[PDB]
Scaffold this active site. Structure first.
Site, short mmCIF file in Angstrom:
data_model
loop_
_atom_site.label_atom_id
_atom_site.label_comp_id
_atom_site.label_asym_id
_atom_site.label_seq_id
_atom_site.Cartn_x
_atom_site.Cartn_y
_atom_site.Cartn_z
N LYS A 102 -0.76 0.97 -1.25
CA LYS A 102 -0.06 0.20 -0.23
C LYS A 102 0.35 -1.20 -0.68
O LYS A 102 -0.07 -1.69 -1.73
CB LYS A 102 -0.89 0.17 1.06
CG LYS A 102 -0.96 1.53 1.73
CD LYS A 102 -1.67 1.47 3.08
CE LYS A 102 -1.56 2.80 3.80
NZ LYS A 102 -2.35 2.80 5.06
N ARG A 109 -8.36 8.20 2.86
CA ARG A 109 -7.04 8.84 2.78
C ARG A 109 -6.31 8.33 1.54
O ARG A 109 -6.06 7.13 1.41
CB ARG A 109 -6.24 8.51 4.04
CG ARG A 109 -4.86 9.15 4.12
CD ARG A 109 -4.13 8.67 5.38
NE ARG A 109 -2.86 9.37 5.57
CZ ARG A 109 -1.70 8.96 5.08
NH1 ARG A 109 -1.64 7.83 4.39
NH2 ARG A 109 -0.60 9.67 5.28
N1 LIG Z 1 -5.16 7.54 9.76
C1 LIG Z 1 -4.12 6.95 8.95
N2 LIG Z 1 -4.38 5.82 8.28
C2 LIG Z 1 -3.42 5.27 7.52
O1 LIG Z 1 -3.70 4.09 6.82
C3 LIG Z 1 -2.16 5.86 7.44
N3 LIG Z 1 -1.17 5.33 6.70
C4 LIG Z 1 0.03 5.94 6.64
C5 LIG Z 1 1.11 5.34 5.83
N4 LIG Z 1 1.64 4.11 6.43
C6 LIG Z 1 1.82 2.81 5.60
C7 LIG Z 1 1.73 1.56 6.22
C8 LIG Z 1 1.89 0.41 5.46
C9 LIG Z 1 2.15 0.51 4.11
C10 LIG Z 1 2.32 -0.71 3.26
O2 LIG Z 1 2.11 -1.82 3.70
O3 LIG Z 1 2.67 -0.56 2.03
C11 LIG Z 1 2.25 1.76 3.50
C12 LIG Z 1 2.08 2.91 4.25
C13 LIG Z 1 0.26 7.11 7.36
N5 LIG Z 1 -0.72 7.63 8.10
C14 LIG Z 1 -1.93 7.03 8.15
N6 LIG Z 1 -2.93 7.54 8.89
#
Ligand SMILES: Nc1nc(O)c2nc(CNc3ccc(C(=O)O)cc3)cnc2n1
Ligand SMILES: Nc1nc(O)c2nc(CNc3ccc(C(=O)O)cc3)cnc2n1
Ligand SMILES: Nc1nc(O)c2nc(CNc3ccc(C(=O)O)cc3)cnc2n1
Ligand SMILES: Nc1nc(O)c2nc(CNc3ccc(C(=O)O)cc3)cnc2n1
Ligand SMILES: [Cl-]
Ligand SMILES: [Cl-]
Ligand code: NA
Ligand code: NA
Ligand code: NA
Lengths: 269, 277, 270, 275
Positions: free
Chosen positions: D220, D254
């Site tokens: 991330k 995850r």
């Molecule tokens: N339970 C759960 N927990 C998570 O952490 C999650 N993240 C994502 C993916 N979403 C992101 C959000 C922010 C960022 C960035 O800042 O890079 C990247 C991906 C999708 N489902 C998710 N489900």
């Protein structure tokens, strides 16, 4: 777009506008609306006659089983309806018996390539549709669209020339670019490219036949199963006629007939 | 630089990478099939004017591993080779896997043999050894390999090993070192590679260059470019140029292309960049 | 490490090459025909004790005769032992009855060429081994080794494509170059060439099975009768596993298992 | 050591933190989009081989810095193909009730909702489906990152998660079917880098809420920002965050990188429990 054909009795039939050829497949293995018995095939024929078909194309494509399927249907249609009958086959014996039973024309997806077919059509004196079909397995997307079109035109011209040499009259030849995927050896973009460039086939001087009805190209662009491909198919027929097609081969006679009348008027102003 | 020793012992010296223009004369050929003699000659004339060093003519009808087809291949090839030999100064390469096609093509004026199947067909090694022409040996196109079935590193090692064996087969047969060109066989389909494997071989091209023989690379208009750009073959020019640039930057000696002028101009920049080390 | 998926959709993972012990129950079968049910079960018991992962049972009017020999053995084995059962047959009806009786997979020397075989295996949802079987018109040595190999791979690929088209799942296909002479239409050097080139079969992306056990090419190279072919046979097993084979079909379970354990270790240390 | 109750009433027990591998089948994803059934299956096979306990399948495109049928067409074939092949638990990453029902019907074992069942019918859908659900904290509204103290932001996160938990129990969702997640991320996840690290440092406060805690830092932007690295180069930093999350008592991680994560968190687990 008006055109004429000379039937086997030297009788000239004139089409004042593009013709609609309704499909009746009697092969249980067809992708759309297979007819398993005579009665069901005749129910479809009656509907298509009511919807205004000009020609009914009967196909059932190992030779005797093809005959057992086709002949009863051709005979019944010949007895009941005034429509021209096309038989969709590549087999010389089927052509002979089909015509003896009442077929007025032969539709060959293999353009009379199967030995004896050429001489048989010349001998029967019926109009014939020569569809373009790969010499053998072609890799779709393996050439530019332009060069592919060049090869299709070249091969169709060669087929036409073979027909003329064998003594088939010029007013008995229809050509068809052979729209489709799978063993028709084209991808989606190639099919649409040939549709866009259909006037190049029309300029070859013979009536052009086009069949998009419910085919996979429509399925792929719309993400729809064959039963849901009506509106997309109509669009292809409209464009084919707008570009000068003479005959449209379709599972949906009334819808095609009405749609292409609009294409004809647009084209003819 | 590198040179090729022709069958008459004359040495052609290349001070910069050579550009080999493609003329396919079979109906089932890739990109632009030339369907008659005149069309083939129009392309040759264009490529000559665009500054080709070699013209590669191929007209294979069928795979010899699976005669009438041999004669069909000859009927397509010889008139083109003969016309080019009479008209132009360019080196002529014949793209074939059949010993008889090799012999007749060379007698008609072909200067070198380009074999996608690395002289694996019966009698090919002896034929080329006797003809005394340079030959390009490609990574054998495996129609049955499942791409990705080994890692990039291992696949690369297997390609290198196979090319090294083909070199040795040639040397044992009496083919001299200065008449051997190698090619990692870029492509998908029957070439038994996927997109990532092709790009891995290109990135690792210096490993082929270090084997000490001129390396030939052919990306032109191929499916790898189509898959990455989502474009049909007529729209792959700029992607293809990029691959030629990178191949030359990494040391490739010969580029096989449908687009001679564009390739020639682009790789000149690659050559200059590579030279400032 | 490879896996198969049984007809109940259960994923079976093998952490190393599997040993498939052979139990031939036809009187004209190779090496050791088992002439009665008791003898077959004694062999099964020995092979289970020796660490067999799979037991391949084969007994090829004639269909009925094949069933009467096979089923009692498959039934007994299914009730007593946890090993996977393979049935070596080309007949669709035998395939159905054997699987209904407890066979977990089908081994076809004819690669489902017999009419109805394809549709039968697809419906049964069992793994299937497709062996290459050269045309019976073939004359060993009449083409170069390289040429022959291309035709073997091409024909195996075509068998694989037939299976997929018929709806057989990719994780249920095993392939086999079909080592042997006689009706297997190869000579000694062609067999060794295919063995040396086994990674080319592994490259097709499916588990590869190999069976050299006690066969004539060992007898011919060593000038030995079947009883004296053990050391040569395991040498071939070692090389096959070293080259990436997933399953070894053998009359000698303990010896093969121990030999290929060394091959697996040697291969694994990259 | 934690447990969940599947909709068949069977209890599944984890003796160590579970690794949840990510399979996104949407075209626009910032890391490893899967554009076809086959690519998704290759990834699944690899993750299963690497020891994943759960596969999280999502059809929603995830770029934090910027239809139901389309999501189903991408998801259902993958879920089906996985259900028929692997014993691993299947999670569906979605906020759409219809997708929840169809995915579960196709074989999904739990629901991972980035909106914590906020969309109407989601609550009642999950209660009736009887599957475990992950409630991830997400901005109730467009929050300005860095607009409060870290301490006060954390208070709001804990209060809002606790409200979400309570809504679930009231809707009749079993206590052994609730997972919580602080929702690590930037962009529309409504946090900056320092805020994400603060929550991670304070993970034990979420762990003390009595439910298994899920954490997702994998490749991330927080890692990208701190290391100045594109997604492909964020593995080592991602591993570090997973290690800290597990050390602080996270139950599920995850990740895009199953083997690496599993190995690193085994070290974290060993250290945490050596006591
Ligand atoms: N339970 C759960 N927990 C998570 O952490 C999650 N993240 C994502 C993916 N979403 C992101 C959000 C922010 C960022 C960035 O800042 O890079 C990247 C991906 C999708 N489902 C998710 N489900
Ligand atoms: N003259 C003529 N012209 C045709 O176009 C035609 N099509 C069929 C039907 N064949 C196909 C081919 C491809 C496809 C697909 O991709 O969906 C469907 C059906 C049968 N006879 C035909 N005859
Ligand atoms: N020495 C040499 N080197 C080549 O690279 C080459 N390529 C072709 C053309 N063959 C292909 C293969 C793959 C593809 C695709 O994936 O698009 C296209 C064309 C013919 N002769 C060749 N000769
Ligand atoms: N999948 C598979 N793989 C085999 O290798 C095999 N072999 C036999 C036995 N057949 C032979 C063939 C040749 C010879 C010889 O030359 O000695 C001996 C036995 C039976 N089923 C088999 N099934
Ligand atoms: Cl080419
Ligand atoms: Cl045997
Ligand atoms: Na018209
Ligand atoms: Na060649
Ligand atoms: Na030489």
């Amino acid at each position: 777009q008006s055109f004429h054909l000379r039937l086997r009795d030297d009788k000239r039939i004139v089409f004042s506008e593009p013709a609609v050829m309704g499909i009746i497949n009697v092969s249980p293995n067809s992708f759309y609306h297979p007819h398993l018995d005579l009665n069901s095939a005749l129910r479809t024929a009656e509907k298509m006659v009511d919807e205004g078909a000009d020609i009914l194309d009967i196909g059932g494509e190992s030779t005797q089983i093809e005959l057992d399927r086709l002949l009863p249907v051709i005979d019944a249609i010949k007895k009941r309806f005034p429509q021209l009958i096309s038989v969709d086959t590549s087999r010389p014996r089927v052509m002979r018996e089909a015509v003896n039973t009442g077929a007025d024309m032969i539709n060959d997806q293999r353009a009379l390539q199967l030995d004896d077919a050429l001489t048989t059509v010349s001998a029967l004196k019926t109009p014939v549709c020569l569809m373009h079909f790969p010499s053998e397995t072609r890799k779709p997307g393996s050439t530019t669209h332009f060069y592919f079109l060049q090869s299709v035109k070249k091969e169709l011209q060669e087929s036409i020339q073979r027909c003329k040499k064998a003594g088939i009259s010029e007013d008995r030849i229809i050509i068809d670019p052979g729209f489709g995927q799978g063993n028709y050896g084209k991808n989606v973009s190639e099919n649409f490219y040939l549709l866009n460039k259909l006037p190049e086939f029309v300029a070859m001087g013979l009536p052009v036949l086009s069949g998009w009805s419910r085919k996979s190209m429509i399925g792929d662009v719309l993400n729809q199963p064959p039963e849901n491909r009506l509106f997309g198919s109509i669009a292809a027929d409209v464009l084919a006629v707008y570009h000068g097609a003479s005959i449209i081969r379709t599972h949906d006679v009334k819808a095609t007939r009405e749609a292409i009348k609009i294409a004809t008027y647009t084209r003819s102003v």
